[PDB]
Each structure stands twice: as C-alpha cells, then as structure tokens.
Amino acid sequence: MKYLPQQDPQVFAAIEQERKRQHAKIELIASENFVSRAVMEAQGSVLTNKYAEGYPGRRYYGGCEYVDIVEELARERAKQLFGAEHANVQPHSGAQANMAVYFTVLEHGDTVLGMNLSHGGHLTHGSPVNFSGVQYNFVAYGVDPETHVIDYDDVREKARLHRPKLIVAAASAYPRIIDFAKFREIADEVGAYLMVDMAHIAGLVAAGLHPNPVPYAHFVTTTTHMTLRGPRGGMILCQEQFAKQIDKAIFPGIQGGPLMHVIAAKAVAFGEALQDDFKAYAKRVVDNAKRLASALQNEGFTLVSGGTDNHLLLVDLRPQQLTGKTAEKVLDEVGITVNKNTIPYDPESPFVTSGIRIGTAAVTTRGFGLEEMDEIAAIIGLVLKNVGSEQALEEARQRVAALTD
C-alpha cells in the first residue's frame, strides 16, 4: 500500500495486523478462503466510482459502457462455470442473493420448506430472528438421527404436509453431497419451486466435485467468497424464464446501485475458477478434508455423518465431554481457528453446542497438503484431549507455528 499508511496509520496498522494474523493462524472456518491479488486489485479499483443501477445495456445512467463490459464478463464467466441460463452478479452478499429470490417467488406469509437450522440449514433459511423466518412461514426437514444424512423421506412428507410454495436445499454445515435431483422431484410432486443455496459448495460445483444444482433448480443462490474463492458478495443463477423477474427483484426490488468494483472482482474470481489449476485446487480441498476427517477419527474423534463428501466436517465432541464453545476457545488459544456449531439433535443450545465446524478451503489455498492435515489433526487431538494441560497447549502452539512458518 502507498497512500493508506500515510493518510491513515490507525486503519493501516489494523489492516497490517489482520494480514499477519491470516498468515500466522491455522484458518479452519469452513466458509473462509484467501482471494488472489488480482481479485483484490479489482475491488480496490476506481469502479468503486460509478453508479450503474440497471443492467448492461439497460442502465439508468450514462457512461456505463465500460462497467457493462465488466458485468457481462462476470455474467458470462458465471454462465460458463455453472451452465445456468441467466446470472445476476449484483447481489451484495449471499443474504441479498437469497432475499431477492424470496422477494421474487414469495408473498409475505407463504410457506417455505428448508433444512433444519440445527442440522445444517443456514440463518437465511428460516431463522425466526432472520428476515426469512420473519417474513415467511418456514418449515424444516431434518437429517437421520444416526447417519446424519438428510432424510429425503422426511423432506417429502414435510413438503406434502405443509405444501410450501418454495423448497430450499443446501446448507452452511452439511458435510455430505446433497441430492438435487431428489429435491426437485419432491418440489414437482407438490408444485413448489426449488431453490438451491450452494454458497458453501460453489467452488466444488465449479470444479465438478459436487453435483451441480443448476439443472435441477429454478433458482440457485451462492456467495462468491467461500469455496469459489471470490470477493465477498452474492450471485443468483436461474432459468431464462425467471431472468427478468430476478433482475427486477435485485433492482429496483431490493438493492440500489451495484458494487461495480466487486462485480469486477467477481469476474476475476470467475476467470480463475475457469482455469485448470482452480480445478486442481478444489480437488485438494476435498482430498484434504477427507484426510483431515480420517486423521481426526484416528485421534478418537466422532464426526457427524462419519466423515465428509466435501470441504467441511463437523466434530461431535460429546465423547470428549466438551462444549463446541469450549473446544473453539482452547483451539483459539493455540492458533487454530474453528467455529462452534450445533450438531444434529444437539442437547446444547446454539450458543454452546456439542460440535466444532471445520473446513479445508483456506489452508488448501495456502498450500497445505495431506501431511499438514495429519499434523493439524494430531494437534487438535493433543489439545482437545488434554484441555487442562498447559504443556499440551504450549506444544500445540509450537506445532502450529511450525506449520504456519
């Protein structure tokens, strides 16, 4: 940076901090990643500078000829990535992407069927403190109590019982492949629309490592920042038939001027995802997650669903008589970042939990491989199995620092 350090030492110090932290810690928060310098340069550009309400070639402001090129690049690279008939790359976030689909297809009070929030469903899928649960009538389907795999029979009974206008599939804490074909078949049974929120698995979908929801869903929403490793923001994919309504849901519907600099970073991240090495990267993400899962079970940990189909895993800490809240804090003491996360049928409340959610997308980006996964699992074992030992914690800290350089 050149001008920031001089103009704003305080903000620059904190940024420099955050940069060093990202390097020093072992980042295991499943929704995180590290973007490339080109993505950051696109967001730090003068595109931040333009009002561009409307869409390419149909703007409400003159002078959009060049930001229209950037948007169309993003839209077209998305279409290439996912095979969707239409993309809207304006959503400011995963939340806004979900909100626009709900604005489009639902009337206030309508019934929506989503994944149980304590089984993997996201906040934007019906939490009662969330707009989704406040505006609409959300009902949930759950995972099997023993396999922790979505119970498709439960999805179907719930659809048939409650007759939702919309069915939402996908999650923020579900370690197994989701069967989009089954969800769509159920949606058609009850005449509901199908929305897939692939935020967590978008990069895996882009790399062919997770079934693509595009051909099954009427709408597909996602963040551009998780496994897709783009800037922080959203995107909606949909069939051509809903194209105009989704675009109008985004604007003049729920947003105003789009973030054109972010939309330029989206196009840049999409370009990266279209290359072969992004595919090699995604592959390592999943390989790494499997490796880490295996290694954690080798250490004595129970995993929700017994392992993982994707980038993430959930540790059920009941066997070690630990709180997720406790494990998250002790791991934070040695430089390992995870999230507490409720496990299906959790006896503890959401603010305490019986599990920790872990993902490998960030460490994979940084170059960690299967041997690092083995080490990280051994570190987690030493810590979580010896919570009151300060020497275990010190040893773990030294082993974390050996990993992060």
Contacting positions for ligand PLP (CB under 6 A): 31, 93-95, 98, 122, 124, 170-172, 197, 199-200, 223, 255-257
* Residue 253 contacts which entry, ligand PLP, a second copy, none (Cβ below 5-8 A, type-dependent): a second copy
Task: Output 196 or 384, the one with its CB closest to ligand PLP.
Answer: 196
- Name the minimum Å distance from CB 240 to ligand PLP: 24
* Residue 229 contacts which entry, ligand PLP, a second copy, none (Cβ below 5-8 A, type-dependent): none
* Residue 358 contacts which entry, ligand PLP, a second copy, none (Cβ below 5-8 A, type-dependent): none
User: Is 369 within any annotated ligand binding site?
Assistant: no
Burial of 358 (0-12, 13-18, 19+ CB in 10 A): buried
Task: Output 265 or 376, the one with its CB closest to a second copy.
Answer: 265
- Name the minimum Å distance from CB 356 to ligand PLP: 16
* Residue 171 contacts which entry, a second copy, ligand PLP, none (Cβ below 5-8 A, type-dependent): ligand PLP
Task: Output 258 or 381, the one with its CB closest to ligand PLP.
Answer: 258
Query: In this structure, what token pair is assigned to residue 225?
Result: 């920042």
d(Cα 231, Cα 97) in Å, to the nearest integer? 14
Task: Output 30 or 382, the one with its CB closest to ligand PLP.
Answer: 30
Residue type (1 letter), 112: V
DSSP assignment letter at 356: E
- Name the minimum Å distance from CB 42 to ligand PLP: 18
User: Is 200 within any annotated ligand binding site?
Assistant: yes
DSSP 215-271: TT-SEEEEESSSTT---S-EEEEE-GGGHHHHHHIIIIII--S--HHHHHHHHHHHH
User: Is 95 within any annotated ligand binding site?
Assistant: yes
User: Is 93 within any annotated ligand binding site?
Assistant: yes
Query: In this structure, what token pair is assigned to residue 53?
Result: 């309400």
User: Is 121 within any annotated ligand binding site?
Assistant: yes
Q: Three-state SS for 102?
A: helix
* Residue 130 contacts which entry, a second copy, ligand PLP, none (Cβ below 5-8 A, type-dependent): a second copy
Burial 18-39 (b: 16+ CB within 10 A, else e): eeeeeeebbbbbbbbbbbeeeb
* Residue 67 contacts which entry, ligand PLP, a second copy, none (Cβ below 5-8 A, type-dependent): a second copy
User: Is 231 within any annotated ligand binding site?
Assistant: no
User: Is 117 within any annotated ligand binding site?
Assistant: yes
* Residue 170 contacts which entry, a second copy, ligand PLP, none (Cβ below 5-8 A, type-dependent): ligand PLP
d(Cα 26, Cα 23) in Å, to the nearest integer? 8
Rounded to whole angstroms, what are the CA distances from 228 to 112, 282, 349? 27, 9, 31
Residue the block writes with tokens 């604005």:
103
Task: Output 95 or 313, the one with its CB closest to ligand PLP.
Answer: 95
- Name the minimum Å distance from CB 164 to ligand PLP: 18
* Residue 45 contacts which entry, a second copy, ligand PLP, none (Cβ below 5-8 A, type-dependent): a second copy
CB 334 within 8 A of CB 383: yes
Task: Output 88 or 326, the one with its CB closest to ligand PLP.
Answer: 88
Total H helices, total E strands in the chain: 16, 15
- Name the minimum Å distance from CB 278 to ligand PLP: 20
CA 105 from centroid of its chain's CA atoms: 23
Burial 270-281 (b: 16+ CB within 10 A, else e): bbbbeeeebbeb
Task: Output 313 or 327, the one with its CB closest to a second copy.
Answer: 327
Picking from 200, 151, 156, 155, the residue whose alpha carbon sits closest to that of residue 174 is 200
d(Cα 59, Cα 53) in Å, to the nearest integer? 6
Task: Output 200 or 399, the one with its CB closest to ligand PLP.
Answer: 200
Picking from 332, 350, 338, the residue whose alpha carbon sits closest to that of residue 387 is 332
Instruction: Could you list the residues known to form a binding site, using ranges.
Output: 51, 93-95, 117, 121-123, 172, 200, 225, 240, 257, 349-351
Instruction: Could you list the residues known to form a binding site for (6S)-5,6,7,8-tetrahydrofolate, using ranges.
Output: 117, 121-123, 240, 349-351
Instruction: Could you list the residues known to form a binding site for pyridoxal 5'-phosphate, using ranges.
Output: 51, 93-95, 122, 172, 200, 225, 257
